[PDB]
Symmetry: D2
């Protein structure tokens, strides 16, 4: 999880910065 | 956005499959 | 034999390539 | 000059490398 957790976290941050919408997030939460 | 949207979507899907938690998602929603 | 981390790496690279990642970027990465 | 897509590509590659992406994986990607 270290490397995995770090990858997930940095990916999420980049995604948000790229403009990932609240709608995408909400959809993700429903999965 | 095509390529960008497609990248975001596929990245999210992979993230979820890797075990991205509800807690991470919720944190993301608060940003 | 394939961990969650490896699988995520694989999928991420695939998505990167599809998005148009260039050979140059790949070359630079190799130089790291 | 750097689009959101390019920037995301850059950050994703950086994160991939940090996670331990191998040279072999990079070689294979180049062969695509």
């Amino acid at each position: 999880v270290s490397k995995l957790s770090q990858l997930q976290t940095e990916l999420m941050a980049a995604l948000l910065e790229s403009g990932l919408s609240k709608e995408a997030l909400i959809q993700a939460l429903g999965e």
